[PDB]
């Protein structure tokens, strides 16, 4: 009931909620993630510092332009955390990567279910992807 | 007690000066006091108990008239009254306003976090400075300019 | 308390490991815990093991008008690798746009994760750059920092 960090399984840019798996870099050490409805549920009530980050890679040279948003929602049914990252159009000496980070203090009641939904608005949507192991959701409590 | 805090600015217009703050309504309704009090007259945020804290603020803008808007806006957190020799801020943040274009976004976001040593009663002020042409074209989006901290020592 | 924060000495972008000094903004309490900085290896060693919230940041400024184009990367390495995990524990690349009409003249980046640090692990940061006019930018001094603190100290 102290902290939790997990990584997204998704790679392709498709609108909808992301499935996650526990951070393998944190294995050798009390919040749960239901695999069916892809929700992280908080065990103990408290004020947590919740944060996610998102890195994107361009996979097709010379294609892809738009933006990609990532919203965390108190579930069930604005968003608590909101992160939209820009995808630059392709050119010589243009970036092939993009990143965004955001953290905030959220009050989460005991049993509150969290959900993160990925939205994209981009021409040639297939030209960008989520880098494996780089879009992370984490949180830890600061007040019992 | 946990001794935490988080506020969000009432300011929208890009006008140089200190920001007005109010407590996070999403945290209104927690038992702990939250060791940080916003005094309304001087637009300062005094810290209750001394200690070491992770302090962060974020900034988000929207372009509110299409076509214009170019430059940057900066957020500066100063321990007040100023008692340093360099005059630098304890926390700074600069986000840039992209000019209007086809296939160009109408948002800007920035986030920065550090560890501060704030003594008991220390007053903090957050100042906004813009170096932007046609700055009336962008504003701080409602509820997005946030400042928060929490203590990392008992 | 088990926490630490470092400020980089470097301003000129050369590829290699950044050299640090303890953030004066916390001098009233020093570097409480057991975390110490080793100048010869430019690494910060971890005393008490456990899970930490780690973060670095990075701000660059164009210091020659009309020049400078590319991208710089910042990488945190955990030495030695624990369970083959430690290389690029935190990675962060930010681009430096070409100078042009109303173009960006500064660039910033932030990242923060929960890492499980072992007792005796060294933390190093490497700055790698890919720029056409490498000198036209540089690291704003005092702005590229690396800090951390513990949430739980289970071995």
| Token pair 């900066």: residue | B74
Q: Does B150 touch chain C (CB under 8 A)?
A: no
CATH number at residue C107: 2.60.120.40
Q: How far is CA A27 from the centre of its chain?
A: 20
Q: Does B96 touch chain A (CB under 8 A)?
A: no
Burial class (CB in 10 A: 0-12, 13-18, 19+), B144: middle
Can you spell out the DSSP letters for C74-131?
A: EEEEEESPBTTB-TTSEEEEEEEPPP-TT---EEEEEEEEEEEEPTT-EEEEEEEEEE
Q: Do B96 and C104 touch (CB under 8 A)?
A: yes
What is the extent of the structural domain holding C76?
1-155
In C2-37, which positions are buried (b, 16+ CB within 10 angstroms) versus exposed (e)?
bbbbbbbebeebeeeebebebbebbeeeebebebeb
Min distance B87 CA to chain A CA atoms (Å): 28
Contact C11, C151 (CB under 8 A): no
Whole-angstrom distance, CA of residue C16 vs CA of residue C128 = 7
User: How many domains does the structure of chain B reveal?
Assistant: 1
Ramachandran angles phi, psi of A42, nearest 5° = -90, 135
Strands C50-62 and C145-152: antiparallel
Q: Do B99 and C102 touch (CB under 8 A)?
A: yes
Q: Do C71 and A140 touch (CB under 8 A)?
A: no
- DSSP conformation class of A12: B
User: Given in angstroms, what resolution was this structure solved at?
Assistant: 3.0
Min distance C48 CA to chain A CA atoms (Å): 14
User: Which chains reach chain B with 3 or more Cβ–Cβ distances below 8 angstroms?
Assistant: A, C
**C68: Cβ–Cβ under 8 A, 6 or more apart, which residues?**
C62, C96, C98, C99, C131, C132, C133, C134, C135, C136, C137
Min distance C30 CA to chain A CA atoms (Å): 23
**C75: Cβ–Cβ under 8 A, 6 or more apart, which residues?**
C88, C90, C91, C92, C125, C126, C128
Burial class (CB in 10 A: 0-12, 13-18, 19+), A80: middle
Q: Do B153 and C106 touch (CB under 8 A)?
A: no
Work out the end-to-end distance of chain A between its first and last CA atoms, rounded to an integer number of angstroms.
Answer: 9
**Residue C86: count of CB within 10 angstroms of its CB:** 20
Query: Among candidates A136, A82, A85, which has minimal Cα distance to A106?
Result: A82
Q: Do B115 and C147 touch (CB under 8 A)?
A: yes
Whole-angstrom distance, CA of residue B110 vs CA of residue B75 = 10
Q: Do B114 and C147 touch (CB under 8 A)?
A: yes
Q: Which of C53, C73, C88 is the best mutation test for A, with the most CBs of A within 10 A?
A: C53
Cis peptide before A126 (omega within 30 of 0): no
Cα-atom radius of gyration of chain B, to the nearest Å?
Answer: 16
């Amino acid at each position: 009931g102290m902290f939790a960090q997990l990584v997204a399984q998704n790679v392709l840019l498709i609108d909808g909620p992301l499935s996650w798996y526990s951070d393998p870099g944190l294995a050798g050490v009390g919040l749960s993630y239901k695999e069916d409805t892809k929700e992280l549920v908080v065990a103990k009530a408290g004020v947590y510092y919740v944060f996610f980050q998102l890195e994107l890679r361009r996979v097709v040279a010379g294609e892809g332009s738009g933006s990609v948003s990532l919203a965390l929602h108190l579930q069930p049914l604005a968003a608590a955390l909101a992160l939209t990252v820009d995808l630059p159009p392709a050119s010589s000496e243009a970036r092939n990567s993009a990143f965004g980070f955001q953290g905030r203090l959220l009050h989460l009641s005991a049993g509150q279910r969290l959900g993160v939904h990925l939205h994209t608005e981009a021409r040639a949507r297939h030209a960008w992807q989520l880098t494996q192991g780089a879009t992370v959701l984490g949180l830890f409590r600061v007040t019992p």
